[PDB]
RNA sequence: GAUGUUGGAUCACCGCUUCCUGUAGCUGCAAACGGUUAUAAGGGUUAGACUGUUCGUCUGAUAAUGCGGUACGUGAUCUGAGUUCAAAGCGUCGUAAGACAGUUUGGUUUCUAUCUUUGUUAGCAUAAGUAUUACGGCGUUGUGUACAGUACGAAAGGAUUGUUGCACAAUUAACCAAUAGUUUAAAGAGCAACGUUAAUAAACCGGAAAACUUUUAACUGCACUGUGCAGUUGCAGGCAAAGCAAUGUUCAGCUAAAAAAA
RNA sequence: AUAACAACUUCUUAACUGUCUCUAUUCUGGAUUAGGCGAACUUUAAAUGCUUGUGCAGAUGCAGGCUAGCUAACAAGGGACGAAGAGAC
RNA sequence: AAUCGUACCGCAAACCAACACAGGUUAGUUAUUGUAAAGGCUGUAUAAAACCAGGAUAAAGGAACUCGGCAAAAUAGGUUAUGUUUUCG
């Protein structure tokens, strides 16, 4: 549950490392979690990938909200994380420092879930 | 309340003979109907009848994939027909039913009487079912138990909800108040404007503003009966029910259903004939599958990549 | 019965904070016990009823428990030793009630409600309360029902020293 | 309530744990074709309320930091618990201290199976 | 012998000259995206940077971000940034007192509701219960995706149709088993949403009343400013080894009971 | 131009937070219920509905179309071109 | 060695404010490490509305509020190697 113009950690290799959500897609309601793709700018980068000033796509990927399941049960972060995406929907790293969840187990994240080091699944 | 009486005056003698007579006949009445209880068809537009229940409260259960299911439990302790109408006397047909049981000296002697007449006890709730044919009737006495229901149908649940109080708009409409801080004055939680200038000049009908709220009838439509158990006349309908403990709630087939749908259901017509106590405790069964969207895209994804 | 509210305990406000709430219920407590009769208020008088029946219990329980919690409750020395002494022995049987309220209309000045809060089993009472033990009938219903639920129903007074304790001095001596 | 207690017992047997106690939870994951796995963490809240008890567990990890769950004591996907040690806590304050400050809670690195 | 100024906050009723969601023609309409005319006012009409602003420029999303009337709606409901008193500075004009219709900093916002309008509730007035029909209120929403890379088309591009299926959002209605917050004369209490369930309709809700039925024509009360679906083996008091508004129970208060024998 | 100084005006950074997304629960006092005591603004006369038309040109009171149990309590503040001060502009 | 003051109130219900007025009113003395000797004073009867005032706690976000960080919150305190500006303090 974070609302808009919240800031988040990267937890990729890309170089980024502070981002600020500026925007939401579809109608995901007034806030976003695990699992949804936003729009950030990048507040402070060190790299030559990405640089401050520049708006992205990303996914959330770590929250501190409870996250509920279908059997009564649910889980908690301690910090709020995401992962940068290109236009055509692939990350901009190569290595994510994250702990995977059953979100990711999706078709669509079969990329995120090769370069993940750990995972919950 | 109602207007003052109007006034009466006697008849003249050349019309007073005339008009008893005439009044005498049609409220001359022939003999009541006795139903039969037998199993009928079902067809396309028949509605059977409804039960009067108790709420008992909310519990949890697991099914059989593993899913937390929230439970509502009402309980059905005496359920019976007590009085018929029909179109001779009344001009339509219909089946009332009564619930529970009182004391004697606990009651108006006019609530009593039509009871004892009748060889019945006395019941603490009355309400009454249209039916659409004189054959739909059932005979006085018959009880309606928890096998009047289907495992697995849905159902609709009436009752009055739970009491509050005098209330602010904030709570009773969701008005949105004023702000904390920056000026204001003494005007944190009020509904503000209620109108504009001398044109139109005065306050609508039904407009919003404080008041009681909490005691009034709401219907929910569209529930899963989950389980059923006969022998102690308990229904476990998933969702939420209006009225705290102890409310009285009427069940009903649900009139979101198709008649196909009622058709494979099989439901009793016009009710479950035979001994409800010796039968099993059911639970539903939904092939159905919660974690589909693991396996195959069916969830909602608004970006297009590319 | 004494109405049940929302605050912890479910006691009375008194219109007052809990501080002084506190403070005023421990001094009404102390002089039940020495007078053993009080006209009050009907809010107040309600309080103290229940108040004081479980300021009882605690002297029927006679250790160095309860007496502690009691020393903070009662404000003077003799009104304490009368608790775990007196009034210890006079309720060893009565299970609960054991303090009566019966209302007495209303006062003159700002009509408030007034009521009367005496103990329920000593000379000078109001009535005669029923026996702490219930006699049983030789012939009744009741005696067999008793039997089959609960054998160890207590039917007469027992001593202050029971057959066991007698036994072990008399073989002891 | 009770009902369902009696036959709930008859079905699974676990040790009578406690809030400090370090714990191995075998679990099935319905999302993963309902795979078998096993986690090893501290157990921080245990609530005793009939068929609606639950409890809390806790775990470091090397990187991604910590990790909390609450799992219902009752519920089918759970398949066994074990005890395997304990840490110690003076109070709930320094408890909460604890968990806030990821350190020496780093028992397994990951899930087994 | 006084009809409170601009903009906004809060809450509204109406018109259609229709921005989106509809229906039917024409096209310089292959499909897709469009253009234009007729008809249609049920629902919807976004979050932010600059500016006292209306307006205006720009940014990320959106099915779309329409216009107008209502004392340019709305201060006996709120706000006082601008404008429009007394202080002061600068520029220009006047010999001066001073002026600006230029600019800058600062500068008091009252009212216990008699009538009418409106939301709720009680008493009184024709006994109580069930109540067809009639009357009044409410308004049946939107997006993505699958059926299909199929119809169409050289290629590229790319659909129509549905009382359709599925997921989600807003609105409305309640709900408290679980989850989160909250009270120390504490808690498996109560109330709550950040939590759960349901709806896309001849469905749902309110009051009067024909007819019918019953009665010796009915009429306080459990500390009662939460609820009584509790009226005498009745009870949210007390007491117990008990899940603590539950189970058990000999005590307290309201309201004490019986012909003998055969 | 200028170091220091400023309950002066302007912009920015760090941190913090119910200012806000979006509110919820709770304590103390008032309101609200009961007994006692006991004011004030105001008042041509009143038994004081809606709507369109009309008119010293924005109607509780005039004309057409409608409106039928009775008196109050608790609560809100559209209208009575509401009250206060023989308009300051 | 005569003469005048000596009662009572005096941070106040007795003095100045039309009042038993949350305002105004001079000097001299007393206990107390984290506390505090003497002395002095004292509130009609209840509670589980809306709303208002003064407090407390609060998930995730942290100025997105607003004319304006108004109000509220916030490790706030002490010693520092080094650097900057000075009218050299
Ligand atoms: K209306
Ligand atoms: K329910
Ligand atoms: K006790
Ligand atoms: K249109
Ligand atoms: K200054
Ligand atoms: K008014
Ligand atoms: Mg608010
Ligand atoms: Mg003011
Ligand atoms: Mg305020
Ligand atoms: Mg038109
Ligand atoms: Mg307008
Ligand atoms: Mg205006
Ligand atoms: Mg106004
Ligand atoms: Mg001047
Ligand atoms: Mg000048
Ligand atoms: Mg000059
Ligand atoms: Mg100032
Ligand atoms: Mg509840
Ligand atoms: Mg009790
Ligand atoms: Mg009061
Ligand atoms: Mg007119
Ligand atoms: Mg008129
Ligand atoms: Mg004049
Ligand atoms: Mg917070
Ligand atoms: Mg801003």
Same mark, same amino acid.
């Given at each position: 549950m974070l609302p808009n113009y919240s800031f988040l950690k990267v937890?990729?290799?890309?170089?980024?490392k502070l981002v600020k959500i500026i925007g939401f897609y579809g109608?995901?309601?007034?806030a976003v979690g695990v699992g949804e793709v936003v729009k950030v700018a990048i507040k402070e980068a060190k790299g030559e990938k990405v640089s401050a000033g520049e708006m992205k796509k990303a996914v959330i990927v770590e929250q501190k909200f409870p996250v509920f399941r279908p059997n009564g049960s649910h889980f908690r972060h301690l910090r709020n994380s995401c992962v940068l995406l290109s236009?055509?929907? *692939?990350?901009?790293?190569?290595?994510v420092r994250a702990l995977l969840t059953?979100?990711?187990?999706?078709?669509?994240w079969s990329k995120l879930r090769t370069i993940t080091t750990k995972k919950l699944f | 309340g109602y207007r003052p009486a109007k006034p009466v005056y006697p008849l003249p003698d050349s019309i007073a003979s005339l008009v008893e007579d005439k009044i005498a006949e049609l409220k001359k009445f022939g003999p009541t109907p006795e139903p039969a209880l037998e199993p009928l068809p079902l067809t396309p537009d028949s509605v059977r009848v409804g039960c009067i229940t108790v709420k008992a409260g909310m519990t949890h259960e697991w099914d059989e994939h593993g899913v937390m299911i929230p439970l509502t439990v009402l309980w059905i302790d005496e359920c019976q027909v007590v009085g018929l109408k029909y179109?001779?006397?009344?001009?339509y047909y219909a089946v009332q039913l009564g619930a529970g049981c009182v004391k004697q000296?606990?009651?108006?002697p006019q609530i009593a009487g039509y009871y004892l007449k009748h060889d019945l006890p006395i019941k603490r709730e009355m309400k009454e079912y249209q039916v659409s044919?004189?054959?739909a009737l059932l005979p006085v006495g018959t009880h309606i138990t928890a096998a009047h229901f289907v495992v697995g149908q849905q159902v609709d649940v009436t009752g009055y909800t739970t009491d509050k109080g005098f209330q602010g708009v904030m709570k009773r409409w969701g008005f949105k108040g004023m702000?904390?801080?920056?000026?204001?004055?003494?005007?944190?939680?009020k509904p503000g404007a209620t109108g504009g200038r001398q044109d139109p000049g005065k306050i609508w009908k039904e407009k919003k503003l404080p008041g009681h709220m909490g005691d009034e009838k709401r219907t929910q439509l569209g529930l899963e009966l989950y389980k059923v158990d006969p022998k102690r006349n308990l229904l476990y309908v998933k969702g939420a029910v209006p009225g705290p403990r102890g409310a009285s709630i009427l069940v009903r087939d649900s009139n979101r259903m198709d008649y196909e749908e009622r058709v494979a259901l099989?439901? @009793?017509? @016009?009710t479950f004939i035979g001994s409800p106590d010796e039968l099993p405790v059911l639970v539903r069964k939904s092939?159905?599958?919660?974690?589909?969207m693991y396996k195959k895209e069916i969830d909602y994804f608004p970006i297009k990549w590319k | 019965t004494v109405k049940r509210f929302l605050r912890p305990g479910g006691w009375?406000?008194?219109?007052? @904070?809990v501080k002084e709430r506190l403070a005023l219920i421990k001094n009404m407590a102390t002089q039940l016990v020495e007078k053993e009769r009080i006209r009050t208020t009907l809010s107040k008088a309600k309080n103290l009823q229940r108040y004081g029946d479980k300021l009882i219990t605690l002297g029927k329980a006679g250790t160095r428990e309860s007496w502690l919690k009691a020393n903070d409750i009662v404000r003077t020395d003799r009104e304490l030793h009368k608790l775990f002494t007196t009034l210890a022995l006079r309720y060893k049987?009565? *299970?609960?009630?054991?303090v009566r309220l019966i209302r007495a209309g209303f006062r003159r000045g700002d009509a408030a409600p007034v009521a009367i809060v005496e103990l329920?089993?000593?000379?000078?009472?109001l009535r005669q309360a029923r026996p702490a033990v219930t006699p049983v009938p030789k012939f009744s219903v009741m005696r067999w029902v008793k039997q089959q639920?609960?054998?160890?129903?207590?039917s007469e007074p027992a001593p202050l020293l029971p057959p066991l304790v007698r036994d072990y001095l008399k073989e002891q001596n | 309530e009770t009902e369902k207690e009696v036959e709930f017992q008859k079905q699974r047997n676990y040790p009578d744990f406690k809030v400090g106690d370090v714990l191995d939870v075998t679990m099935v994951a319905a999302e993963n074709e309902r795979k078998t796995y096993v986690h090893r963490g501290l157990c921080i809240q245990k609530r005793?309320?009939?068929?609606?008890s639950s409890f809390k567990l806790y775990c470091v990890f090397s990187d991604s930091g910590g990790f909390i769950q609450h799992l219902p004591?009752?519920? @089918?996907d759970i398949l066994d618990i074990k005890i395997v040690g304990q840490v110690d806590y003076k109070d709930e304050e320094d408890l909460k201290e604890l968990v806030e400050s990821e350190?020496?809670?780093?028992?397994?690195?990951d899930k087994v199976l």
């Open positions: 937890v990729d290799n890309s170089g980024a109608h995901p309601g007034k236009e055509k929907g *692939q990350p901009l790293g190569n290595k059953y979100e990711f187990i999706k078709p669509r | 179109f001779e006397k009344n001009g000296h606990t009651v108006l044919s004189p054959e702000p904390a801080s920056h000026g204001v004055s003494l005007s944190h939680r099989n439901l @009793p017509y @016009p092939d159905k599958d919660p974690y589909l | 009375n406000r008194l219109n007052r @904070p049987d009565r *299970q609960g009630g054991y329920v089993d000593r000379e000078g009472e639920l609960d054998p160890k129903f207590i | 005793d309320r009939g068929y609606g004591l009752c519920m @089918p350190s020496r809670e780093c028992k397994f690195l």
